[PDB]
CSV table of C-alpha atoms and ligand atoms in Angstrom, one decimal:
chain,number,residue,atom,x,y,z
A,1,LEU,CA,-4.7,-20.7,6.4
A,2,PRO,CA,-3.2,-19.3,9.8
A,3,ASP,CA,-5.9,-17.6,11.9
A,4,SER,CA,-3.8,-14.2,11.7
A,5,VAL,CA,-0.6,-12.7,10.6
A,6,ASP,CA,1.8,-9.6,11.2
A,7,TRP,CA,4.3,-8.8,8.7
A,8,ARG,CA,6.0,-6.5,11.1
A,9,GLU,CA,6.9,-9.4,13.4
A,10,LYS,CA,8.9,-11.1,10.2
A,11,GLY,CA,10.4,-7.6,9.9
A,12,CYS,CA,9.3,-6.7,6.5
A,13,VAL,CA,7.5,-3.4,7.3
A,14,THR,CA,9.3,0.2,7.3
A,15,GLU,CA,8.5,3.2,9.3
A,16,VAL,CA,5.2,4.8,8.8
A,17,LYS,CA,5.4,7.8,6.2
A,18,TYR,CA,3.7,11.1,6.2
A,19,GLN,CA,2.4,11.8,2.7
A,20,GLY,CA,0.9,15.7,3.7
A,21,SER,CA,-1.2,17.4,1.4
A,22,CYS,CA,0.2,15.9,-1.5
A,23,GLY,CA,-2.2,12.8,-2.6
A,24,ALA,CA,0.7,10.2,-3.1
A,25,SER,CA,-1.2,7.2,-1.2
A,26,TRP,CA,-0.9,5.2,-4.4
A,27,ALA,CA,2.8,5.8,-4.5
A,28,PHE,CA,3.4,4.6,-0.6
A,29,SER,CA,1.4,1.7,-0.9
A,30,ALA,CA,3.4,0.4,-3.8
A,31,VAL,CA,6.8,1.1,-2.5
A,32,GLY,CA,5.3,-0.5,1.0
A,33,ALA,CA,4.4,-3.7,-0.6
A,34,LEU,CA,7.9,-4.0,-2.6
A,35,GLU,CA,9.9,-3.0,0.7
A,36,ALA,CA,8.7,-6.4,2.0
A,37,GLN,CA,9.4,-8.4,-1.2
A,38,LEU,CA,13.0,-6.6,-0.8
A,39,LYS,CA,13.1,-8.0,2.4
A,40,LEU,CA,12.1,-11.5,1.8
A,41,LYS,CA,14.8,-11.9,-0.9
A,42,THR,CA,17.7,-10.1,0.3
A,43,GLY,CA,17.3,-9.8,3.9
A,44,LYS,CA,17.7,-6.1,3.9
A,45,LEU,CA,14.7,-3.5,5.0
A,46,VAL,CA,15.3,-0.2,3.3
A,47,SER,CA,12.3,2.4,2.7
A,48,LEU,CA,11.9,2.9,-1.2
A,49,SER,CA,11.6,6.1,-3.0
A,50,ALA,CA,7.8,7.4,-2.8
A,51,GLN,CA,8.9,10.4,-4.8
A,52,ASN,CA,10.4,8.3,-7.4
A,53,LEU,CA,7.0,7.2,-8.4
A,54,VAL,CA,5.3,10.5,-8.1
A,55,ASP,CA,7.9,12.3,-10.2
A,56,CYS,CA,8.5,9.3,-12.8
A,57,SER,CA,5.6,7.1,-12.8
A,58,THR,CA,3.3,10.0,-14.7
A,59,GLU,CA,1.0,10.2,-17.6
A,60,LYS,CA,2.3,7.0,-19.1
A,61,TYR,CA,1.1,5.1,-16.3
A,62,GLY,CA,-2.2,6.9,-15.7
A,63,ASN,CA,-0.8,8.8,-12.7
A,64,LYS,CA,-0.9,12.1,-11.6
A,65,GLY,CA,1.5,12.5,-8.8
A,66,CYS,CA,0.1,14.4,-5.8
A,67,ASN,CA,-3.4,14.1,-7.4
A,68,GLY,CA,-3.7,10.5,-7.3
A,69,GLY,CA,-2.7,7.3,-8.9
A,70,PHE,CA,-2.6,3.4,-9.2
A,71,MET,CA,-0.3,1.1,-7.6
A,72,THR,CA,-0.5,-1.4,-10.4
A,73,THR,CA,1.0,1.0,-13.0
A,74,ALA,CA,3.7,2.3,-10.3
A,75,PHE,CA,4.7,-1.4,-10.5
A,76,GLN,CA,4.7,-1.5,-14.2
A,77,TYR,CA,6.9,1.5,-14.3
A,78,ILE,CA,9.5,0.0,-11.7
A,79,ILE,CA,9.5,-3.0,-14.1
A,80,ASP,CA,9.7,-0.7,-17.4
A,81,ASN,CA,12.5,1.6,-15.5
A,82,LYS,CA,14.4,-1.8,-14.3
A,83,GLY,CA,14.5,-0.4,-10.8
A,84,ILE,CA,13.4,2.1,-8.1
A,85,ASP,CA,15.5,4.4,-5.8
A,86,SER,CA,16.0,4.5,-2.0
A,87,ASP,CA,14.3,7.0,0.0
A,88,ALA,CA,17.8,8.4,1.3
A,89,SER,CA,18.8,9.0,-2.2
A,90,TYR,CA,15.5,10.5,-3.5
A,91,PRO,CA,13.6,11.6,-0.8
A,92,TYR,CA,10.0,12.6,-0.6
A,93,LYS,CA,8.9,16.5,-0.6
A,94,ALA,CA,5.1,16.1,-0.8
A,95,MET,CA,4.9,18.1,-4.3
A,96,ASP,CA,5.2,16.9,-8.1
A,97,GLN,CA,8.7,17.3,-9.3
A,98,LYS,CA,10.9,16.6,-12.4
A,99,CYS,CA,12.0,13.0,-12.7
A,100,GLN,CA,15.6,12.8,-11.2
A,101,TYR,CA,16.1,9.0,-11.0
A,102,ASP,CA,19.4,7.7,-11.0
A,103,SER,CA,20.3,4.2,-11.4
A,104,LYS,CA,23.6,4.7,-9.5
A,105,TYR,CA,21.2,4.7,-6.3
A,106,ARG,CA,19.0,1.9,-7.4
A,107,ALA,CA,17.5,0.4,-4.2
A,108,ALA,CA,15.3,-2.5,-5.5
A,109,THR,CA,13.8,-4.0,-8.4
A,110,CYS,CA,10.5,-5.6,-9.6
A,111,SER,CA,9.7,-8.5,-11.9
A,112,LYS,CA,6.0,-8.6,-12.0
A,113,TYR,CA,2.9,-7.8,-10.0
A,114,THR,CA,-0.3,-9.7,-9.6
A,115,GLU,CA,-4.0,-8.2,-9.4
A,116,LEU,CA,-6.2,-10.3,-7.1
A,117,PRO,CA,-9.7,-10.8,-8.1
A,118,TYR,CA,-12.6,-8.2,-7.1
A,119,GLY,CA,-14.0,-8.4,-3.7
A,120,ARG,CA,-12.3,-11.7,-2.6
A,121,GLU,CA,-11.3,-11.2,0.9
A,122,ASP,CA,-10.4,-15.3,1.2
A,123,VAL,CA,-8.1,-14.7,-1.7
A,124,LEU,CA,-6.4,-11.6,-0.2
A,125,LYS,CA,-6.1,-13.6,3.1
A,126,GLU,CA,-4.2,-16.2,1.1
A,127,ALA,CA,-1.8,-13.9,-0.8
A,128,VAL,CA,-1.4,-11.6,2.5
A,129,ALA,CA,-0.2,-14.9,4.4
A,130,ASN,CA,1.5,-16.7,1.6
A,131,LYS,CA,3.0,-14.0,-0.7
A,132,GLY,CA,3.6,-11.1,1.8
A,133,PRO,CA,2.1,-7.6,2.2
A,134,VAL,CA,-0.4,-6.4,-0.3
A,135,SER,CA,-1.1,-2.9,-1.5
A,136,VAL,CA,-4.7,-2.3,-1.5
A,137,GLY,CA,-7.3,0.6,-2.5
A,138,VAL,CA,-9.9,1.7,0.0
A,139,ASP,CA,-12.8,4.3,0.6
A,140,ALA,CA,-11.1,6.6,3.1
A,141,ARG,CA,-13.8,9.5,2.1
A,142,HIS,CA,-15.4,9.5,5.5
A,143,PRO,CA,-14.6,11.7,8.6
A,144,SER,CA,-14.7,8.5,10.8
A,145,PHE,CA,-11.7,7.0,8.9
A,146,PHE,CA,-9.7,10.4,9.4
A,147,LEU,CA,-10.6,10.4,13.3
A,148,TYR,CA,-9.6,6.7,13.5
A,149,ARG,CA,-8.0,5.8,17.0
A,150,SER,CA,-8.5,2.2,17.8
A,151,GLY,CA,-10.1,-1.2,17.4
A,152,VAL,CA,-11.8,-2.7,14.2
A,153,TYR,CA,-12.8,0.1,11.9
A,154,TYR,CA,-16.4,-0.1,10.7
A,155,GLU,CA,-18.2,2.6,8.9
A,156,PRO,CA,-21.8,1.9,7.7
A,157,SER,CA,-22.0,4.7,4.7
A,158,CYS,CA,-18.7,3.3,3.4
A,159,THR,CA,-18.8,2.3,-0.4
A,160,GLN,CA,-16.6,-0.3,-2.4
A,161,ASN,CA,-15.5,2.7,-4.6
A,162,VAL,CA,-11.8,3.3,-3.6
A,163,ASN,CA,-9.7,6.8,-3.6
A,164,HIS,CA,-7.0,5.9,-1.0
A,165,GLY,CA,-4.1,3.4,-1.1
A,166,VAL,CA,-2.9,1.6,1.6
A,167,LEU,CA,-1.0,-1.6,2.7
A,168,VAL,CA,-2.2,-4.9,4.0
A,169,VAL,CA,0.4,-6.1,6.3
A,170,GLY,CA,-1.9,-8.4,8.4
A,171,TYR,CA,-5.4,-10.0,9.5
A,172,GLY,CA,-6.9,-11.1,12.8
A,173,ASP,CA,-9.3,-10.4,15.0
A,174,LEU,CA,-10.6,-8.7,18.3
A,175,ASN,CA,-13.5,-9.9,20.4
A,176,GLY,CA,-14.8,-12.0,17.0
A,177,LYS,CA,-14.6,-8.7,14.6
A,178,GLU,CA,-12.3,-9.9,12.0
A,179,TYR,CA,-9.9,-7.4,10.6
A,180,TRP,CA,-7.4,-6.5,7.9
A,181,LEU,CA,-4.1,-4.9,9.6
A,182,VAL,CA,-3.6,-1.6,7.3
A,183,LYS,CA,-0.5,0.2,7.0
A,184,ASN,CA,-1.5,3.8,6.2
A,185,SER,CA,0.8,6.8,5.2
A,186,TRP,CA,-1.0,9.5,7.2
A,187,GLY,CA,2.2,9.9,10.1
A,188,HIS,CA,2.7,8.1,13.2
A,189,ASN,CA,-0.2,10.1,15.0
A,190,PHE,CA,-3.0,8.3,12.8
A,191,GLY,CA,-4.4,5.6,14.4
A,192,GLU,CA,-2.7,2.8,16.2
A,193,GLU,CA,0.9,4.1,15.6
A,194,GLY,CA,0.0,5.2,12.2
A,195,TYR,CA,-1.9,1.8,11.4
A,196,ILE,CA,-5.7,1.0,11.1
A,197,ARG,CA,-7.6,-2.3,12.0
A,198,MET,CA,-10.4,-2.5,9.3
A,199,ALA,CA,-13.2,-5.0,9.3
A,200,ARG,CA,-12.6,-8.1,7.3
A,201,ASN,CA,-15.4,-10.5,5.9
A,202,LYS,CA,-18.1,-7.9,6.2
A,203,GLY,CA,-18.7,-7.8,2.3
A,204,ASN,CA,-15.7,-6.0,0.9
A,205,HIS,CA,-16.0,-3.1,3.6
A,206,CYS,CA,-14.6,0.2,2.1
A,207,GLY,CA,-13.7,-1.5,-1.1
A,208,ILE,CA,-10.6,-3.3,0.6
A,209,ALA,CA,-10.6,-6.2,-1.7
A,210,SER,CA,-11.9,-4.2,-4.6
A,211,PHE,CA,-8.1,-3.7,-6.3
A,212,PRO,CA,-5.5,-5.7,-4.1
A,213,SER,CA,-2.1,-6.1,-6.0
A,214,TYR,CA,1.3,-7.1,-4.9
A,215,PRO,CA,4.9,-7.0,-6.6
A,216,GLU,CA,7.3,-9.8,-7.0
A,217,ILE,CA,11.4,-9.8,-7.5
A,218,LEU,CA,13.0,-12.6,-9.6
B,1,B8S,C1,-3.6,5.8,-18.6
B,1,B8S,N1,-3.9,4.7,-18.3
B,1,B8S,C2,-4.6,4.2,-17.2
B,1,B8S,O1,-5.0,5.2,-16.5
B,1,B8S,N2,-4.3,2.8,-17.1
B,1,B8S,C3,-5.2,2.1,-16.0
B,1,B8S,C4,-4.8,2.5,-14.8
B,1,B8S,C5,-5.3,1.6,-13.5
B,1,B8S,N3,-6.4,0.4,-14.4
B,1,B8S,C6,-6.6,-0.7,-13.5
B,1,B8S,C7,-8.2,-0.4,-12.7
B,1,B8S,C8,-8.3,-1.1,-11.5
B,1,B8S,N4,-8.8,0.0,-10.5
B,1,B8S,N5,-10.3,0.4,-10.7
B,1,B8S,C9,-10.4,1.3,-9.8
B,1,B8S,C10,-10.1,1.9,-8.8
B,1,B8S,C11,-8.5,1.5,-8.8
B,1,B8S,C12,-7.7,2.3,-7.6
B,1,B8S,C13,-7.0,1.5,-6.9
B,1,B8S,C14,-6.4,2.0,-5.7
B,1,B8S,C15,-6.4,3.3,-5.7
B,1,B8S,CL1,-5.4,4.0,-4.4
B,1,B8S,C16,-7.2,4.3,-6.5
B,1,B8S,C17,-7.2,5.9,-6.3
B,1,B8S,N6,-6.8,6.4,-7.3
B,1,B8S,C18,-7.2,7.6,-7.9
B,1,B8S,O2,-8.5,8.2,-7.4
B,1,B8S,C19,-6.7,8.3,-9.1
B,1,B8S,C20,-5.8,7.5,-9.9
B,1,B8S,C21,-5.1,8.3,-11.1
B,1,B8S,C22,-5.4,9.6,-11.1
B,1,B8S,F1,-4.8,10.3,-12.1
B,1,B8S,C23,-6.1,10.3,-10.5
B,1,B8S,C24,-6.9,9.6,-9.1
B,1,B8S,C25,-7.8,3.8,-7.6
B,1,B8S,C26,-7.8,0.5,-9.7
B,1,B8S,O3,-7.0,0.3,-9.4
B,1,B8S,C27,-7.3,1.4,-15.3
B,1,B8S,C28,-6.8,2.1,-15.9
B,1,B8S,C29,-4.0,2.3,-18.1
B,1,B8S,C30,-3.5,0.9,-18.3
B,1,B8S,C31,-2.5,0.9,-19.6
B,1,B8S,CL2,-2.1,-0.7,-20.2
B,1,B8S,C32,-2.1,1.9,-20.4
B,1,B8S,C33,-2.8,3.1,-19.9
B,1,B8S,C34,-3.5,3.3,-18.9
């Protein structure tokens, strides 16, 4: 129940990445979540390969690389593959390539994941604070989202149907307006040094709590 959290303060969050024209938000959200679990378990912060997912977690996992995917099935891949690579060994090139996974350069591992219940921002607050950063889908289809610079983001035409993957690294409030602290993979020059604060407890605003999920290492 702590009023506000920020996983950057605990050293569990990597640099803000840049997905470019390639629509791999799902991959970045997934690697982002795990990065923290890797830090909580081993004390090391290393950026995990988003490309490894784009190239290797494909048809079998209902994913289509640069044309979208799911964080849930990405975790499944990492479990099935018994590991993921470091971004340094398998870097991001913003396009669909052949699977080039090398276990020699295995950076981390995943044991299971957990899909949090639909639209429950209270449960999402619990997970974020107790378990760590949570991969979520949101409705980023509107210009206001692209244009976002600062403060608590609220779009009245935003639906609960999610198309874009992001990572909830914290929560809190600004002048009474509650927010979710979301790391976005759209470069450092998006919003607040690559982050966006989005309205919290305003009826699952933009589908933030629609499909939340987090991995775990054991
Ligand atoms: C082929 N295949 C699947 O597609 N799934 C599933 C993959 C995901 N699940 C979970 C449904 C929950 N959910 N519903 C709606 C929207 C999202 C969602 C969450 C985050 C983001 Cl970023 C997005 C956006 N993704 C896309 O727009 C997108 C995804 C894939 C793609 F190819 C193109 C676009 C959606 C979600 O997770 C259902 C079926 C399978 C499951 C099994 Cl056991 C076996 C084969 C499967």
